[PDB]
Design a binder for this molecule. Structure first.
Ligand SMILES: [Cl-]
Ligand SMILES: [Cl-]
Ligand SMILES: [Cl-]
Ligand SMILES: [Mg+2]
Ligand SMILES: [Mg+2]
Lengths: 408, 409
């Protein structure tokens, strides 16, 4: 298995002389993974109250996507991290951070570490969760900051709040910045994790009575809190000068609300402005925002992507050659026909494109392609090719990951 | 390979082989009322001499009742309560079970009663599309459900007809079954005390002190008082008609709604401390539970703990119905003394409540904490470990069992 072979199997055409290559050469990298944020519940107003004003404001000054998809399996948050760090698929069976925490895993932090970046990840819960204390070394992060680093002050749910996350991380980044140390920081938010129970004094949305004592109402309070704290973190990055010297990426780890299951009177709260009339496609959309210094071309990215695509997309902006490193993702700024294979909650060979989703049943022929306007799509040759490629890619990714060398 | 015996062995609660009260209510009707957002630490409260729940307080002298009965809910609280009660299986840590498994043939209390000559119905004044009830109720084998279409749009409180309309329109249906010798199980789901607790001004009967007036807790007290009043009127009709003397009647709160430790300091004096558990969330997770059956000679406080999953096995014993090979994760609370209640979703998996302490894990079992209900720490002994392991295994088995249920089509 080689990098070329994998790319040929996927069959997505990527520019040989890529645009934006090294547009952010030598810049820092800050990535924030936002817990349980989904695109169809962002940019929503409840009686004039914006739920995600921070994300809404970023649309004018970033490249962002309305068709960016989660690529997760059994352990959703950890599968998101797996996808992003490794550009390999999460398992259909295992939790990869558990099963492969004993391997030497090629990765984004490892590659950046070979290009003079110090690398760290930040999360306020204990790193024993999902085997993170083994996984983070396995992917070659120089450091991870876990509950031991963050206090037990201002707990929301089961660990310190996003406010504590950003306030304790920022000074570390500021000191690296002042000392001319190129850095990659990954922050994993948590305050908007289910059950979305936010202290009363931190709830800022006055909910209408059809949202009171509902999962969706609680979700909106938690997302609003998380978005607020993100905005305060961004303002500190701007004031400090870090923003103008860094690539910054924000994405939701995965969806949490099944919007077609909502009570009928709550459905009016779902954002329909970029709705896909196919499930689970619509819900599987996660917000995605990308900033880099001196960007001249902000706006909507048309090519679809998933979490596995973040690494190749970012490495291109940072001007880093990936060489022989196997990546199952694609640089989304240098392709136009990308697609995203899915598994676990969907059968193997399921995938999303920029215009339709395919899902098999007992066989390819008994499956269904559904256009994003809701109409059926005939199972043509191209639909078949992506199904076959998707299944082969998953096989290769599973085999590749399973054959990684042991750390000991 | 999951059997009823295996599940019971995993839980490890000792249940009398020759049970007491078996068939004490053989052949009687069953009426169960699920009271929206009632919690035990906000019942039997007086505000300046005014009783908030005088109906429930009065029942204490003539029922078996519990001061340590717990909610067992997850993502969709009201529906998870119904799930727990009808199925005696745990709500999911991930799904809303009434949504995800509404396409299954689900073994249940109404299904089992239907095989013992009961006609079964559930009543709720909102639209049955909510939480997939219009599929869930058939899935568990209710003969009928009566929803908003049946109740009309008179006397709306909040978003649907009042508890008064619920009881007034249900009663004549029960009365006709009674007169025609049709044994029945009726499940009524109240709604007037749902948040935001908006009760019409002419229906507010508590004169609130200024530290409660126009506050969430104040509105909560008016709504609970209204709901308790209407429950009392329903009971009086059951008594007058003769149905009361021919029926097992169970009342329970679906789940708590007020986080009492988050109240303003001056409102905390309103919380009932008389049977306080000095552990959270144990204290708030207590829901009222009252059981009546005709010719009961032994009214008073049930010492053994229970949760919503325990209602089915407890009731089937009273009705003299053998459950056979039907898998139940709950326990007959009148024939055990060491029952415990696993919790999830708002607590980590392996958390549980006993009659004397709560356990909650952290990163591992060993880094968790057992807290006695007097507030003191409890050392993590072998028995504490066994219940943690059993709790986690029970949740796994329940999730697997429910996921493997056959499709209705
Ligand atoms: Cl008790
Ligand atoms: Cl559930
Ligand atoms: Cl139990
Ligand atoms: Mg997550
Ligand atoms: Mg409820």
């Amino acid at each position: 298995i080689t990098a070329k072979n994998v790319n040929d199997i996927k069959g997505v055409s990527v520019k040989s002389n890529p645009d934006y290559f090294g547009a952010a050469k030598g810049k820092n990298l800050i990535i924030v993974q936002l817990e349980s944020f989904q695109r169809n519940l962002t940019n929503v107003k409840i009686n004039g109250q914006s739920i995600t004003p921070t994300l809404d404001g970023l649309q004018n000054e970033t490249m962002y996507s309305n068709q960016f998809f989660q690529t997760v399996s059994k352990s959703n948050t950890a599968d998101a991290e797996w996808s992003v760090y490794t550009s390999t698929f999460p398992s259909g069976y295992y939790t990869n951070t558990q099963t492969y925490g004993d391997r030497v895993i090629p990765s984004m932090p490892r590659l950046l570490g070979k290009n003079d970046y110090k690398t760290a990840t930040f999360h306020t819960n204990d790193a024993s969760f999902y085997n993170r204390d083994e996984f983070y070394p396995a992917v070659g992060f120089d450091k991870f900051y876990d509950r031991k680093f963050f206090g037990d002050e201002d707990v929301i749910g089961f660990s310190p709040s996003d406010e504590v996350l950003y306030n304790k991380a920022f000074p570390i980044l500021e000191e690296q910045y002042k000392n001319n140390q190129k850095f990659y920081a990954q922050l994993i938010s948590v305050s908007s994790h289910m059950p979305f129970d936010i202290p009363k004094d931190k709830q800022e949305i006055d909910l209408p009575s059809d949202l009171k004592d509902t999962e969706l109402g609680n979700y909106f309070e938690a997302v609003h809190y998380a978005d607020k704290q993100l905005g305060e973190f961004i303002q500190k990055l701007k004031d400090s000068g870090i923003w103008d010297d860094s690539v910054v990426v924000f994405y939701g780890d995965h969806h949490i609300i099944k919007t077609d299951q909502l009570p009928e009177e709550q459905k009016k709260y779902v954002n329909r402005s970029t709705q896909l009339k196919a499930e689970p496609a619509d819900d599987y959309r996660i917000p995605f925002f990308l900033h880099y210094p001196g960007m001249e071309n902000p706006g909507e990215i048309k090519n679809v992507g998933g979490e596995i695509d973040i690494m190749p997309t970012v490495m291109n902006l940072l001007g880093i050659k990936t060489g022989d490193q196997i990546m199952f993702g694609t640089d989304i700024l240098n392709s136009s026909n990308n697609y995203v294979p899915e598994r676990y909650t969907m059968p193997e060979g399921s995938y999303f494109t920029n215009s339709y989703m395919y899902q098999p049943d007992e066989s390819f022929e008994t499956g269904a392609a559904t256009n994003y306007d809701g109409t059926n799509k005939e199972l043509s040759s191209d639909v078949k090719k992506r199904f076959d490629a998707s299944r082969k890619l998953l096989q290769y990714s599973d085999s590749y990951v399973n054959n990684l060398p042991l750390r000991n």
